[PDB]
Amino acid sequence: YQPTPEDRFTFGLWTVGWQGRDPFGDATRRALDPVESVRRLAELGAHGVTFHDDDLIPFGSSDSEREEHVKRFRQALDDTGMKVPMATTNLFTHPVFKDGGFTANDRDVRRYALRKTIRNIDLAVELGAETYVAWGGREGAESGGAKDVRDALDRMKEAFDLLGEYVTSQGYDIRFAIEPKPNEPRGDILLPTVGHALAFIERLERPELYGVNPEVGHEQMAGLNFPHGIAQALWAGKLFHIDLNGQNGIKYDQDLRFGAGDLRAAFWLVDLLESAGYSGPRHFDFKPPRTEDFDGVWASAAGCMRNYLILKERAAAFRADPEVQEALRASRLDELARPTAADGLQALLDDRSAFEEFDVDAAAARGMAFERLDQLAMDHLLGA
Amino acid sequence: YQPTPEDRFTFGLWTVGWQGRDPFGDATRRALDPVESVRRLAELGAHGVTFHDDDLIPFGSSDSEREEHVKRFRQALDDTGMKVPMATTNLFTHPVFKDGGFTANDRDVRRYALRKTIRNIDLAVELGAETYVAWGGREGAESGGAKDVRDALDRMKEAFDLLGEYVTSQGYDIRFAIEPKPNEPRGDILLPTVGHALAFIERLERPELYGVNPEVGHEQMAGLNFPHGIAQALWAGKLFHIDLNGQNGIKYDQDLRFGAGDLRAAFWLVDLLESAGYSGPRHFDFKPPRTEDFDGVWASAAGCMRNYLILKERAAAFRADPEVQEALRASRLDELARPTAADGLQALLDDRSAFEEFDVDAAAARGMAFERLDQLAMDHLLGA
Amino acid sequence: YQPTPEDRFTFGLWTVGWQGRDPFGDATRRALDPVESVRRLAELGAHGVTFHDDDLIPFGSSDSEREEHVKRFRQALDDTGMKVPMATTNLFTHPVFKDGGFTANDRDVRRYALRKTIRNIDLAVELGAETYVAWGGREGAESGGAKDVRDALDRMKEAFDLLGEYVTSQGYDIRFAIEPKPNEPRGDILLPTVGHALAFIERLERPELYGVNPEVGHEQMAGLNFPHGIAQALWAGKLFHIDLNGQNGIKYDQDLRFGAGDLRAAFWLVDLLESAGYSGPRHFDFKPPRTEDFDGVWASAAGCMRNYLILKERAAAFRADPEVQEALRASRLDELARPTAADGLQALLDDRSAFEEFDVDAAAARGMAFERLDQLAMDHLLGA
Amino acid sequence: YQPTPEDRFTFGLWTVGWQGRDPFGDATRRALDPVESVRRLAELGAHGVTFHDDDLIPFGSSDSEREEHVKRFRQALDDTGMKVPMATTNLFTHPVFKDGGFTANDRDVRRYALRKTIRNIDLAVELGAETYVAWGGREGAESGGAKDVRDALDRMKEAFDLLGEYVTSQGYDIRFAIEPKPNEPRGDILLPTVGHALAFIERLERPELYGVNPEVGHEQMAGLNFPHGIAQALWAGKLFHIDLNGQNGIKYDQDLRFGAGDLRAAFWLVDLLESAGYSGPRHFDFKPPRTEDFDGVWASAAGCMRNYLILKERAAAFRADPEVQEALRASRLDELARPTAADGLQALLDDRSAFEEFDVDAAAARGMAFERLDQLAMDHLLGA
């Protein structure tokens, strides 16, 4: 279960670089130089790294400092063969973003947010990024009067449409991925789930430029089934990026290493990514717990990739097992994939086997055999 | 706070008619004749009633029995002036639907589900219904192997497209509203939130024929903010129907009377419906608790309408209060409603006030004044 | 992973016998004769069965019918070697219990509840039961005025004290186990968690007669950590019975087979039961999903036991692995088990190494190595 | 609704003094001098203030700095008439506490935690505090192997027993209150609810010295009913302190002002505190949202007290309304308060009206009238 760069495992600089400050706690680790993170990740078998603007270039840097920070990072990438497939903007840390970036009630802050994003898009393209993530973690409210959501969505659409006009004006090939989260740090966040983000994208001027960046833990903070939401994103053709981690239920955003939290959900996720031929980076957005020293940071990062590769092996074994394939037929997964009425509406209306002569009791008596199928899945997951 | 039929309050026959059977309990009330429910609701000031097929006509009825049941119900409507603005199909009670209707793995069950729906659409139109709700409460899974979600969504789209071809072929004016719910009775339900249902509708062949029917409690079973989701539905032009009730958090579907559960959320909901000029029925999907006798059933139904009218008065008083209007300006709700960059992209890029000369510290220091605004809202809600 | 009766696996008659009625659904299976359930469970390797009064003897039975039902069940036990280690009273199904049994507002219902319990205690003792479970599923409220909780707890204490006086008066060896659940079917249930039940027991007249019967899914319906609560019960000496099943988070009570739901929590649970030498029955309180026919019922029951035995093997391998034992020392689990201040208070107060000369920075810099330990645990669970 | 110091409203220095740093955000406000907070709170009508050690004296202060900080705070108290009814130790911010204080796996950290607590107990007594709160926010785990919970509870008991021996040795009148929280910042926190803390206290060497300090939001982060838990604490005689705030469901700890979040729960809470004659401080543990400037901080604090006084008035009006008193009798709240069997066990066993001649159908048919009672409660809350 040794990763190599051809598994396309990627990590945010902010993941391994998290210093361990939490709502109730000071930092437990020193800050990492991005160069060290690139080196250590490469050595673990990662393929690439991702960044917010402010992770690579300290906020408020001079042009000379900006150039120096980028030069050093570029050297580390050259030294290791690491890629930068994705970048993003920090529109949440600085106090000016306390009511949002794109949907801030103050118009001047909205304009600033757009300008800060556009500056970093240019940098992302320079570094070879194919995807630009937007996480509107400050977009939302704690109270009902504070944010008229229809006006906020107008602002959000205006922002995304301006960024799509910008990338089109420059001829860039980069696409956007909107990352949903239901709450935290705002009491409620706008576009709180994969569904809401998909729906919003369809109202943009150039929808083809936008997809989603779903995170395991974020959909689980609403008690939703993450594999199901990923299936709907894939169905829509919108899975442009993914954040892999773990989460134990409905609580604060834990960002556990991938495989921790809901292990069975992790199994079904990998099964779906691999069966669907998802071709994007397997990106980890996780925090090594603050209990850990640096050795533990790298152990946690390595465990992300290990767990993905173990799950990949088990899921593949499940699907290739002739006994599973029989069980799938016994549970009529083959019939689920057939059209209901390829014969057309009038044929269905005239088909007496569909209503007047349908034996509902006989059809109701047929067991679905899902428990046997699921115990096969359990036995494969556990290697039993 | 006395309702009259011109408040457009409506109730499902299954609401007041719930006999009180729960996962762990037998019925505590006798079944109601739909005629009695129409009469009693009319007397309380309701405007109309809604029905599943199987609430009005017992499942398996002969054609003569069907005609008799409809004749009696039509007489009650004529006697009272009650309307039937919405109908729906029961695709969840009968054991044949144990794995779904439209997304059942068995193809024969999918076809049957469509035929049962189309029969009831014809009846709904006969009774004057403008909206047809679909609640896919059996569409989903308890286990990961049982349901390939992409194939299930293909089936779901096929079903909805066939029903849209049917209503178009008949020249009916009726529209569809998809009702999301995240879980219960299935471990996870497909299209689990307002967002997912909105996104799915955009992939239908005739999207204009479909909207959502969001329920207060259902979005709250995912810990989501119901007013926010209603705002996104209104933003999309998709709020075709609404189910009003109460819910205490993330748990089984309680279906409390409206106003119970999250009272502040109820306030913000009414504020939004009324400010947006929502013109559909104020439909209650609630269960009088099984502790209640029939007197308590009608008291609970009356309380639904009372609470809506009290909230309406308080919300209107909030928005009309000059002190609130001042507070709204102090919190920059007026600026949220202004375009970010009506000057256009190039003008924003060239505007040094948006970046190079933006005083981020000064903008960060400006308080949003949201707590004062929210205490005004509290004082108006409580009549303090 | 083949169970035998010496693993002490037990099942409620209501588990495998669940007909599949849910809030929104009719039965999908026929009722089982208890004799058939005893036979089929025995054949799967179960050790025993448990019952509510009303599962073994239909409610309202004559004395002759009662005797016949018990005679047939006794013959099945004799035929198979099955035991009956636990029984319980149904104080939730009948409409008379709509506001509770022991804490019903109506005094006559409280008295009836006690008399129905005492009748079944006598039967439980006749059948050899060592434990009598009380699940107060109707004790609680949907609304704040309906139940004065302090008066309800007085009533609950009075009930339990009367049942303890009864068993003492008869010389029975049976003990009570109170089963917590946080909600469902009541909006909130009294004694909603293991903690609340433990605390309540300490106020009973004969606390030694009462423990807890924690259920995996019930503590997970409050988002709590089930292994932690079981550890507190074991710490208190109060783990008199356990209900094993699965649950996917904060939602309605799913009662999945054991191993489903939170698999990692299941692993840590088995590790704790086995390490602590828990000697009670491994009782499953699960519902075979209503999608299943009878074949699937028995497959689901078999999977309960299989998953326990796989987890037992993996947990034992974890604890016996010298690499894990090293990792445990590296994370200072050995120091957690040492007394903080066996030297006593004055010695601690005078110990300058504990404060004045404690190097807090050096102690803060030491990583806990928990991620490496947890990846060892993951690798053992998965057999990697 | 103007508070005066005789309503006994108190605030933590850390509440109004919160600078607005969150998991994803820098501070939005400058630090407050405790003297300014005392002054501003006094002016709003507060009665007192509470503190962690490290809020009053910066961590690592010299003895001269410690004396100066305490002298200035004492002058502010003298200038205003403010009291200090409660104090607490910060055992969570400093990195040395990353795995806990009292239950840290490192024994040296446990000893340090005790010494830091005992130093502050002496200071609390000097300042007149009657209650000392312990919040074990770092006691717990993110992973199953990291913390053997039975050994951690042994350590926790040892710590609390040593602190009780200390206060007894000094002749202090101060008592302890343990504050539960279910998670955050640890993945799961030990003693996660009011129930678990009550149960644990009964195993201490001097239980009479310990009670609970329940927080509105903390029990709501487990989806529990806060009024119910407060009723159990009052029933046990253990409500030694309370933290008042708001929370919107199962999510991160919001610490909204009191009255925000679950408003109906706030109403039932005040009703219970006032009806039970709770005599402790009405302490607010809230965070003015980081959107706010200092003006908004004081507005938020004022709103805490206003909302309590509005709820107090409405609850009192409810209980004094003859129509409510009639409704309470109609719902048999008077019978709930009567003993079930003051006649004794043998009399109940011989009472044929309790079983053999009990008309269960007649008792089941009697409605509880809870909806009418609850609509009265709603109408009183809203002043309708």
Ligand SMILES: OC[C@H]1O[C@H](O)[C@H](O)[C@@H](O)[C@@H]1O
């Ligand atoms: O910018 C996108 C990233 O930003 C932040 O670090 C969020 O916490 C993380 O979930 C997100 O993936």
Ligand SMILES: OC[C@H]1O[C@H](O)[C@H](O)[C@@H](O)[C@@H]1O
């Ligand atoms: O058909 C739509 C209706 O069906 C059922 O009764 C559902 O429980 C309810 O939420 C839904 O509104």
Ligand SMILES: OC[C@H]1O[C@H](O)[C@H](O)[C@@H](O)[C@@H]1O
């Ligand atoms: O009587 C105790 C048993 O009763 C019921 O069937 C409950 O649903 C179950 O959780 C409980 O274990």
Ligand SMILES: OC[C@H]1O[C@H](O)[C@H](O)[C@@H](O)[C@@H]1O
């Ligand atoms: O010390 C007790 C106090 O400490 C912290 O500030 C906690 O966050 C708060 O809930 C608690 O009341």
Ligand SMILES: [Mn+2]
């Ligand atoms: Mn996250």
Ligand SMILES: [Mn+2]
């Ligand atoms: Mn992320």
Ligand SMILES: [Mn+2]
């Ligand atoms: Mn509902």
Ligand SMILES: [Mn+2]
């Ligand atoms: Mn509904």
Ligand SMILES: [Mn+2]
């Ligand atoms: Mn259960």
Ligand SMILES: [Mn+2]
């Ligand atoms: Mn159980």
Ligand SMILES: [Mn+2]
């Ligand atoms: Mn809190």
Ligand SMILES: [Mn+2]
């Ligand atoms: Mn607190």
